Write a protein that binds this ligand. Structure first.
Ligand code: CTP
Ligand code: CTP
Ligand code: CTP
Ligand code: CTP
Ligand code: CTP
Ligand code: CTP
Ligand code: MG
Ligand code: MG
Ligand code: MG
Ligand code: MG
Ligand code: MG
Ligand code: MG
Lengths: 557, 557, 557
């Protein structure tokens, strides 16, 4: 199997992840079955512990893995569905070697970082690179491996030593190394400095790997004097020194790498089945990036979120809105609202932030209430959902935003105002949203509804069924314990909020639609994880169609 | 003696030289006698070989050393006059140890980089730190040493090993280490990255030195989260992590370091005689930097130069004009003209550049023709000198610009039009400028007029004598072989170009003034090397006084 | 051209020089024209400054270079005659780049360690590798380069960086890298430790070279568990991990390397013209090493030397006696006498050392008085020469030992007892040995008789003429200012000391033989520099023939 290791030299933030994704998109576009692995040298075994303000969003895989948001980037840029073990961590690798030691699988030998942790990294890479990750059943051809942190980090030492050994298990004509490095320039001279690239490549050779491409991250395109000096210290030819300068879009990074001629180099170096050709599918990526720079018409939506600021807490929710806005030829404007700042309570302590949040909500062409857990921000979310319903604004509720949209319709439209959740107010007089965990043979106690599940349409009279292509059912990704109470469903059948999607066991109601409204829907699944740049996730496409006013024209095709 | 070594971590362009100068200015302002050394790890033994487009200007010392332009920065920021051996080079140190080996001073032992090159660096530092460099006869108190290149460079290895040994010859309470490092930030996240500082400080500890301050070069002020993380890896307290972010002026860098509290730290660390005090002379520097940001009135001068572009070819010529413009409360505008682009010949091949050069010359409030050597640009210089004379524009000619201003007055005002130089057209029919080298006992052949020489005024009727404070003579720095022909001086005495300055031997005429003009003067010395920020060099002060029109009012005080 | 760089990893004393010599002997034995270069990273430009107690002997080349004794090892192990520039030094390379800077050959650019010192090392290697060094006129095929010091030394940094660049100027199929490393073992466990090899190979990869063989220096042969672990960290195959454990003879090291199969590897790696073959000339080396272990009969000689102990002061004098003793099938016993300990004066201060020196001299089968300079030890040398003459012992006097053997025959056999030298007692009443330097056009003043000179036989009645193959003249290497006085030659013609060799100018007498003695000869040249393991230098062969008593039987063949 062919392997591309992507490493970082100078500083951790240089974009190793967009390079590795774009390399993957390129090789996918050449007609190769591409898999991808990420090494996160952190001790967390999975993402499920993360508070989304720190580190970012938790991404959910088809298999029910809770994984880093960076593996969602590989799922967007390559048409693939990763398994949880395409994320390798220091926590996973050390936990696996510890468990083998406790069982005595190491035959009473001393278990050591070299060879035994380093052998575990190589066994795990060869095993997961062989797992099919496209729709096709046949095994992959290239694995793109991204290694987190920078060369010379303590946390990365067991993985660079694993790849030092691995480039001899996989032959020369199979293993390949991309080093991503910072080429800084200062504002006074305006000279691009090769020195951190030199010192990080010296360190990478000491650690025992040698670059096959160098990719320079720089604030403007590198000159030939930089390409030749990097070539003089780093043992690469000047055509094997690339730059990815900072640009308009991540959709442009694959297109810059094809201009910098990386396909020719991988055909030579990895002996790839590509052939010489005048075309590959990157013309569809080139169109999408040239569309993205031409987006002039604004479409502006309010995201009523559980957190004080966006770093990455809604990173794929944002990307699903962008795919949908690109597909609808509008520039997305994401008006983020820290949900607590809508609460009537806060005007007694910070009225400037309270009026600011409501002005931003009143601008909206559509409202998105995304998923989450806990009491925090729920009251502010409820005020925005009820604004969306009363002021006739297009609406998508995801997971928690759907549970709150069942709750507020019972409170405000059935006058069942003692109705509440069970995660918040667990003693509720009429518990309309309830704890209802998944339970199976071979598992201890109740567990989350987590990963891909079939959700079946109840009726042909659904806007989501139309947006999903008039199909009988959908498979979509879930991450929750809680559900609408199945016994309290009767109180809805007289009135405007319908349920339109249901679990295959019948036990759970999973999609709602409010009648007599432009578009108002809630889903229990997270449709953003299934979203792709070339083809938006239908609930977000419907929300942005409805936001500009195109939905009633889209349903005619 | 107290010693401050200043080193660079990540990349060479971070401003080690303005840090080391400003540390020096600070300690000078506290009342200490400060000397300064620079290590240039290049193999050039002196600057005299440099073509000024590459590397920059050649600076001339009082002793006749041809030295790097960076030692001119230490002469400007500290009121000192360096000797040639305050510049240490790899060429100097290796040449000195080779010469001792040839003589057998090393007693037939193998001469080795360690100890013998490293002992030569320490002998040279202790010897030159003891040389008085102020007007005062008493020995210095602090030496500021700047080391060129970055940590981990091959060229810097013999000097970091010398300072590793040296910090035990000079005790702990005498030796101190400033590490200047890049803290980059990327445009997307806007996060200041400590990682290159970490890796360069690890390398500096391996090489055997440990920082006592860290100075961060960054595009904006470093946050406390950066100060604390650098402190966590680098073994400095968070108050010992400074930044010098990019700013309006080099005159502000000393003032930023006093705000960042370095004086308190050097009093503690080096046990300095400063005492605790509410004041030190940096209030005069603080005034000058707050003046420099308030310069609104433009004063615009044409510099008719021998080179295709300014990197640093006229670096102290520019600084002498800036000191003069600050002292006259005007913003200098330096209209640089590549002199060849004034030649009537070039319009036959690039007329766009020809008209562009003459438009820039026609804007001028004053003209400066600086020194140089060779045929190149002389014809274009002559056209600008004759423009300056005919169109009544204020004028300073330095070295070559003075020789050309004697030549063109013979050509165009005495009608001696066969008159020419000897460096250019060495066969001249009437050689008005001639080769006339200095000759002495204990020297082989003729040699340059090089370093400080007494030039004596011929008359009280001189504008330069008035600008020099009505003094009988001046001492100023020279760098030339050539002179006006002493036998052809008779042809001038009837007409408007006077000679007003002469050598003490009488053999050489060294200052000219043209009558019936606002200000038109030429000097054989380079007055810019003697110029200081607090007190401009009189010929440049006169040129910028005359440029705005203030000279006739300045002569009244 | 093919190039073999030999480098040292862990400690400097591991035998890089015997590895590089033996690689050279191997490739010479395969039929290749082999040249050799040594890098000495010391600042001495030549060996002429060395006091032979420190560093060792000064070796003299055919061209008159005074060079390191290590280049004499390459002259012994390969049948070659090196030029002075096959020794590269830090002194030579820095002196050459400094001289080019002073002349302006670098076009007014800043001259830097990278590229300009590193380019000087590569220019010098390509230039000297092309110089023919065998008797054949055709250019070499392989250059063996030995680099002194160890990886990570400051002194070696400009040369490892030169070879890092050089392995891309010379292609992969031309440049090759041997890393010699210590594999220690401790007395308690008896385990061979690969760790210093690992860490020095990591450092060598950082510096930018990667091993192609590893040669382990170890106290016993390395096991396969060591070969496989070194292969696992160092990126060599286990057949490319050699050892040279400590052994009986340097003549065995080539023979151990052919057992460890290096010829096969160089044919593969350097595409060498060798062909596959069942034989190469190393069977003659294998014979000589199996002879050397069978030497049982002692032949014991007194060397009356100018120094307090042998480190290497007589290193090639010793090797010329060993070649001669091997050729005569005797084990040499070298009774070294610190010459001062024979002086009658020393019995007044250390009589134990005085009687010890005379007991060792009285054991002698032959006496060797080697060359030198100065007053020191001359009186003790004279007492041993006069012992050799009076007690009928075989005798060789080299350079100073020849001058003293003319002096003592005038003093004790002509009764000219006021006769003395001019280097010692320069005021002599009858100066029998005189300062007589070589003088030529294109040189300033008088200079040493230095390098190869033709010495012509005066008579057929010479034992040295017989030992030299009855040839009319010899070419041999000289290193002195002093000579026998040509005017005082008349005093000898009546008596037993003949002169038998003379310069081609006639001006100098260069060989003496004493009649009525088994063998007593002196030469002005140093015959040991011309000596080779397969064919001894005739004056030393004659001395060891005469010592056992074989000379009168050798003259019969
Ligand atoms: N395949 C990818 C990769 C990155 N991004 C975007 O780029 C950002 C992260 O950039 P990345 O390439 O991961 O580099 P950094 O995270 O900045 O740093 P690192 O080198 O550690 O990845 C994310 O906000 C994400 O929106 C993306 O959309 N698709
Ligand atoms: N291993 C190396 C590489 C270069 N240098 C030195 O680096 C200096 C140039 O400094 P700088 O411009 O900082 O290095 P560059 O190689 O030009 O890299 P950059 O592109 O970052 O400037 C030269 O004098 C050269 O002797 C060194 O000492 N050791
Ligand atoms: N005492 C000083 C130091 C610097 N400068 C200005 O700053 C520039 C050079 O900055 P410096 O501090 O020398 O840093 P760099 O030269 O950029 O890089 P290095 O760290 O190698 O010095 C020069 O153009 C000079 O005009 C100055 O005016 N006075
Ligand atoms: N010697 C060190 C120091 C830090 N880390 C790792 O560095 C990672 C953080 O990466 P990055 O942000 O790139 O490093 P910072 O220390 O935050 O430095 P910067 O300010 O440049 O981000 C952590 O996971 C930590 O395990 C490491 O492996 N080895
Ligand atoms: N071609 C050679 C090489 C070495 N020797 C012998 O080996 C000793 C020196 O060993 P060498 O191989 O030069 O290694 P060292 O000098 O011990 O250390 P280095 O690795 O620095 O050479 C000398 O005394 C010399 O007699 C020899 O006879 N012939
Ligand atoms: N880059 C490396 C290589 C090895 N080890 C560790 O080295 C230990 C073995 O120690 P030691 O025997 O000293 O190393 P060896 O590799 O066996 O080398 P040697 O032949 O010198 O023993 C193992 O636990 C392994 O984790 C390490 O931490 N880092
Ligand atoms: Mg990432
Ligand atoms: Mg540079
Ligand atoms: Mg500088
Ligand atoms: Mg960080
Ligand atoms: Mg040696
Ligand atoms: Mg071990």
């Amino acid at each position: 199997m062919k392997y591309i290791l992507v490493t970082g030299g100078v500083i951790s933030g240089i974009g190793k992840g967009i390079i590795a994704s774009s390399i993957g998109t390129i090789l996918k576009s050449c007609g190769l079955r591409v898999t991808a692995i990420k090494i996160d040298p952190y001790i967390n075994i999975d993402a499920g512990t993360f508070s989304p303000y720190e580190h970012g969003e938790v991404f959910v895989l088809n298999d029910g893995g809770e994984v880093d948001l960076d593996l969602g980037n590989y799922e967007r840029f390559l048409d693939i569905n990763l398994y949880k073990d395409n994320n390798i961590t220091t926590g996973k690798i050390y936990q696996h070697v510890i468990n083998k030691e406790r069982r005595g699988d190491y035959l009473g030998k001393t278990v050591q970082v070299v060879p035994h942790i380093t052998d575990a990294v190589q066994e795990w890479v060869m095993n997961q690179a062989k797992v099919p990750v496209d729709g096709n059943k046949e095994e992959p051809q290239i694995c793109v491996i991204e290694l987190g942190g920078t060369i010379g980090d303590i946390e990365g030492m067991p993985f660079v030593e694993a790849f030092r050994q691995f480039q001899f298990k996989a032959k020369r004509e199979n293993f390949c190394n991309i080093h991503v490095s910072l080429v800084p320039q200062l504002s006074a001279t305006g000279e691009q400095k090769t020195k951190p690239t030199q010192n990080s490549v010296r360190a990478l050779r000491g650690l025992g790997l040698s670059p096959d491409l160098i990719v320079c991250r720089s604030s403007t395109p590198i000159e030939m004097a930089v390409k030749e000096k990097i070539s003089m210290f780093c043992h690469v030819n000047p055509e094997q020194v690339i730059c990815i300068h900072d640009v308009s879009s991540t959709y442009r990074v694959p297109v810059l790498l094809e201009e910098q001629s990386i396909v020719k180099y991988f055909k030579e170096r990895l002996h790839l089945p590509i052939g010489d050709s005048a075309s590959n599918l990157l013309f569809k990526w080139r169109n999408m990036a040239d569309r993205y720079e031409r987006l002039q018409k604004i479409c502006s939506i309010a995201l009523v979120g559980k957190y004080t600021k966006l770093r990455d807490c809604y990173a794929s929710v944002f990307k699903a809105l962008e795919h949908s806005a690109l597909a609808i030829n509008h520039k997305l404007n994401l008006m983020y609202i820290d949900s607590i700042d809508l609460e009537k309570i806060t005007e007694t302590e910070d009225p400037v932030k309270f009026h600011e949040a409501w002005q931003k909500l009143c601008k909206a062409d559509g409202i998105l209430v995304p998923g989450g857990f806990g009491i925090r921000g729920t009251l502010g979310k409820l005020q925005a959902i009820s604004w969306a319903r009363t002021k006739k604004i297009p609406f998508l509720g995801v997971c928690l935003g759907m549970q709150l949209a069942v709750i507020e319709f019972a409170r405000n439209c059935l006058n069942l105002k003692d109705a509440d959740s069970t995660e918040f107010r667990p003693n509720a007089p009429v518990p309309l949203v309830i704890d209802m965990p998944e339970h199976n043979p071979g598992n201890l106690g109740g567990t989350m509804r987590l990963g891909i599940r079939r959700t079946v349409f109840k009726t042909e009279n659904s806007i989501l069924r139309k947006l999903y292509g008039d199909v009988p059912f959908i498979e979509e990704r879930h991450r929750h314990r809680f559900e609408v109470n199945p016994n309290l469903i009767k109180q809805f059948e007289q009135n405007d909020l319908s349920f339109v999607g249901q679990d295959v066991d019948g036990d759970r109601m999973e999609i709602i639609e409010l009648a007599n409204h432009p578009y108002f829907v809630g889903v229990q699944f997270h449709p953003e994880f299934s979203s792709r740049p070339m083809k938006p996730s239908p609930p977000y496409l419907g929300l942005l169609l409805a936001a500009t006013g195109n939905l009633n024209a889209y349903l005619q095709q």
